[PDB]
Design a binder for this molecule. Structure first.
Ligand SMILES: N[C@@H](CSCC[B-](O)(O)O)C(=O)O
Ligand SMILES: N[C@@H](CSCC[B-](O)(O)O)C(=O)O
Ligand SMILES: N[C@@H](CSCC[B-](O)(O)O)C(=O)O
Ligand SMILES: [Mn+2]
Ligand SMILES: [Mn+2]
Ligand SMILES: [Mn+2]
Ligand SMILES: [Mn+2]
Ligand SMILES: [Mn+2]
Ligand SMILES: [Mn+2]
Lengths: 310, 310, 310
């Protein structure tokens, strides 16, 4: 029962700067003490200095490729997270990565699937994050990780991303909480028949059935390892206000945590990302604490914490 | 795929004046662009000038019949909406009427059922709006449309309402979201065995089962056209604050829209009313935008918009 | 159909003083008029003066036994509530007790089970309130009533509590809404196999199934009388803000009341406690009204009020 909290304070996948402060805020809330309190032998893994990275991030506007912003910086930092996560998993430890915007999942998923090729991926997000290099309108890379991981539109992916191992297939990723999918992304999920459970399915079937369907969708043999990449904006902005891309009509605080308890319950969780916490994008300090405490709650519930005896 | 957005800026069915500004606010939010964006060939239909109507509304206190307020003005304006909606439906276009208080449904339902006599009616509301002429305590006509449409207490309905065609029967109307029913109304729904699904049923069975039961209740042959008259106060005041009669414990933003997606999904929706938006009864501007954006969201979801590919 | 509203303005079971004002606030909201309006012949029963009790409560810090605070005062006042409630039930009236912190349930449950030994108990709370005398960390007695009622850790219960009749067994108590259970309490519910339905079960099965399971858990013959001890902090703080121990992720306003309607619906409710309303712990006056109105709503729904005809 060993764990490595991989710190990935990266904001190059999007415009707003506060998101790279996420790792520190979670740790200040006592994230590591909570994990140890849950019986986990933990250790921190700093992939790179967030200030040094943000210094180059906010200054280097020339880092572009058409509409795509900061492909170079993102490719570099993401490769490092990949190496770190890959290493943590090979050492037999559970990698719990804290972001940072969702572009870091390019390295986390790559790292985990490199050690666990049969691992399924449950993407908890209000967004599909699967825009292609030539299809993204905003050019914000935190909304394109899955396209790169799946090797879509390879005829347009930069050479600086050639390091990304092609280990994630479309039948091994399932979404939960979708409600702000771009038309290009819609076509993509449809053409590739990717298991996507929107807020419609949650409202229609209830969170429990959706989580079960999501686990089943990526676990054919019913024995595969499972990884969860958790974007906090999946949770309704009234619970998680401090985030870059909030979308109305998300999961309630209860569903957000119940989902974690159901996953932890299956016992095959092998990795977890908690991304998009941005303390700066908070109206009041109650917005900060409410968002950061949610990040730690997700971790605790994912990692074993229950309401009753266990 | 032709549509006519019938503008019905009427507030004579209740005390507060801002409700007649609803049509303009929705259109300012881009309601028509959204409908066209959904592939609808749309056109606007102005039934009457809202300012001219409100001028007479706020001044003519003498327009009364006992407890009943503004029966004359309501009868006149409502007959016009009836003629307009009837015309739009005969022209083969989908009439999407924006209010305005709910007294406008006297003309919308009358107009639609006059062209589609087998059409079922789903009344989404926190209230039953079925008080009789001699039974209403407030005298606000927006809470009596269904009594007049059903021909209840005819022995007390004014001659100025004699224009209302008797085309709606009790087994063709189903409620969703009820939670503020007057005792007289309770007796009525019971005696007439009207399909009424309260917040109790939503809490008990879930929104999906309730919508299904509501569609089935008014669609015996399973092929009848369906009309939805949507009062925004059905949605909990914390999502739709700018409204005249808010009632605690309503539908969540998600259920409010999921209901629309389920209806649009059956493919037999033939008309839609979106009523009771009152921008003036908003604490802040965030209350206005939150309420008006909800009105447009209902329209989009009712008219075909989905979270995933379709 | 006779009822006695037992007033129990006690705050000695916890630190904050405003909770003893609950009874008065509910009554000011028209609690008694509501009950009579529901056809109940009601009468008030004042067990003791709240000011006199609070005067001694806030001054006598010496009233302690280790970590346990105010065991003497709590034992005395609680015995009185026991005598009063026992009397009301013997007179054939329904005892609706208003608190006051939850330590008053030591007298209410004792009083009711003394007349109805087969009565089941449904404890609606975010907390288990079953800490033992020697196991409580805070020493606040409102979090220990069930341990004393069940006769747990009797080897450590003070003589001033020897008056408590041992009439409640572990298979006759079922919880609903748990989400802040102490580790010692967890072990206890597990070892005694007490039916405990946490927010997990509500999120997993829905409120309706949970209420049904709770009623079944304490009603083996399916004919036993049922008593509900309702702690308002079970409801999410965003609906019930004015309370001493709010916990995030509670029941929605709708579930909180639906639960009441389902219970009232079985027809075997024999007693009800509505505890922990503290008007002083309110940010604004809207926090007060929102909390107090909830208390009265619980009463109305428990006592027969429905959304439709009945
Ligand atoms: N469709 C948008 C969404 S980006 C969402 C990023 B994330 O899911 O990590 O908040 C885009 O491509 O900019
Ligand atoms: N029972 C009330 C309710 S009026 C409700 C109007 B509407 O449902 O359109 O907000 C009355 O008769 O005044
Ligand atoms: N575990 C805490 C909880 S006390 C809860 C009291 B009440 O459920 O009535 O709000 C303790 O022993 O102080
Ligand atoms: Mn994301
Ligand atoms: Mn997102
Ligand atoms: Mn209405
Ligand atoms: Mn209404
Ligand atoms: Mn309690
Ligand atoms: Mn409690």
């Amino acid at each position: 029962k060993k764990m490595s909290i991989v710190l990935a304070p990266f904001s190059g996948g999007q415009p707003h700067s506060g998101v790279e402060l996420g790792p520190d805020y979670l740790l200040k809330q006592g994230l590591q003490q909570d994990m140890e309190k849950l019986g986990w032998d933990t250790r921190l893994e700093r992939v790179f200095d967030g200030k040094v990275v943000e210094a180059r991030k906010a200054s280097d506007n020339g880092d572009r490729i058409g509409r795509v912003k900061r492909p170079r910086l993102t490719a570099e930092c993401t490769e490092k997270i990949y190496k770190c996560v890959r290493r943590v998993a090979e050492q037999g430890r559970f990698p719990l990565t804290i972001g940072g915007d969702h572009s870091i999942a390019l390295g986390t998923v790559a790292g985990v699937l490199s050690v666990h090729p049969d691992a399924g991926v449950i993407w908890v997000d209000a967004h599909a994050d699967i825009n292609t290099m030539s299809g993204t309108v905003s050019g914000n890379l935190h909304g394109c990780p899955l396209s790169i991981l799946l090797g879509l539109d390879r005829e347009n992916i930069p050479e600086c991303f050639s390091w990304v191992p092609q280990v994630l297939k479309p039948n091994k990723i399932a979404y939960i909480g979708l409600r702000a999918v771009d038309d290009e992304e819609k076509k993509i999920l449809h053409d590739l028949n990717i298991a996507a459970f929107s807020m419609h399915h949650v409202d229609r079937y209830g969170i429990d059935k959706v989580v079960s369907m999501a686990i089943e969708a990526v676990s054919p043999k019913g024995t595969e390892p499972v990884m969860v990449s958790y974007d906090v904006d999946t949770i309704d902005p009234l619970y998680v206000p401090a985030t870059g891309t909030p979308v109305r009509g998300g999961l309630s605080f209860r569903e957000a945590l119940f989902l974690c308890e159901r996953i932890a319950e299956c016992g095959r969780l092998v990795a977890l990302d908690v991304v998009e916490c941005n303390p700066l994008l908070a109206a009041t300090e109650s917005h900060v604490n409410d968002t950061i405490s949610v990040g730690c709650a997700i971790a605790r519930c994912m990692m074993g914490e229950t309401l009753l005896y266990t």
